Ligand binder design. Sequence first.
Ligand code: HEM
Length: 153
Amino acid sequence: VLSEGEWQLVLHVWAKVEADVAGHGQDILIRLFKSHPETLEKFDRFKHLKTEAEMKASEDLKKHGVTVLTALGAILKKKGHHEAELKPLAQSHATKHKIPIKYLEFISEAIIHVLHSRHPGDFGADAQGAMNKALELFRKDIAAKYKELGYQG
Ligand code: HEM
């Protein structure tokens, strides 16, 4: 779990993400993609830029990145109360997104990378540990939802 302090730190960092949700959103995906080709092959609309983003990966990347961060954002904002549901998103990433979490650990790395890159000095040990823990909770929540939905069970 995350303590009130850890949540406040997370929300503080996230206010910076949210302030430039689109930017973080794109950056995170671009980073994820360039780091792990397999994550890029997955999204048909991004996959077309086969060489992990032909230095474009925009407009649609923005739309998704925003959707994506807003969802994880809501989760984080709800400080443990698992997006009020999570289940529908667990279901998509379960059935369509190629079952196991895996890639969510890659986006966790991407998130940590963008955060550290854009917000050094303040995104220190405590902040990164807190964000990482929050991402781990998120991944763990999806893992539990995969059991509920009758996949991970
Ligand atoms: C921060 C973690 C993530 C969150 C909060 C998230 C959120 C979302 C949301 C809200 C949607 C649209 C509705 C839905 O289908 O559920 C979506 C779709 C999708 N997600 Fe994720 N997602 C996450 C991570 C991932 C990762 C790491 C991958 C693959 C590397 C992935 C691949 C997809 C795909 C392929 C779609 C379908 C739409 C697309 O082609 O753009 N997701 N995601």
